[PDB]
């Protein structure tokens, strides 16, 4: 059960949660802050 809980938690990092990408660095390397922040907030809400 504990292994499953951790594996689930890690797999969630691959989710977009409405963002253009699950990868945080790919958002930052592509968008200027005024737009990057929106995409990041979507990931923060999902990951939090």
């Amino acid at each position: 059960q504990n292994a499953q809980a951790l594996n689930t938690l890690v797999k969630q990092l691959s989710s977009n949660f409405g963002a253009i990408s699950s990868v945080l660095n790919d958002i930052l390397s592509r968008l200027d802050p005024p737009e990057a922040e929106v995409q990041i907030d979507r990931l923060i809400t999902g990951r939090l």
Binding site: L6, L9, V10, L13
Partner: protein, 49 residues
């Protein structure tokens, strides 16, 4: 990702020492070691009780 695992305070060896103590107590002194001092008793007599 920031996911780590902490070790237990009591290692497997330490747990083994505790079960050994509890077992040695049970065998050589019955229940007396639980209440107070471990009071040796012939095992057959312990079983009689």
């Amino acid at each position: 990702n920031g996911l780590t695992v902490l070790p237990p305070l009591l290692t497997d060896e330490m747990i083994a020492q505790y079960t050994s103590a509890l077992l040695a107590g049970t065998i050589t002194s019955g229940w007396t070691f639980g209440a107070g001092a471990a009071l040796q008793i012939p095992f057959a007599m312990q079983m009689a009780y």
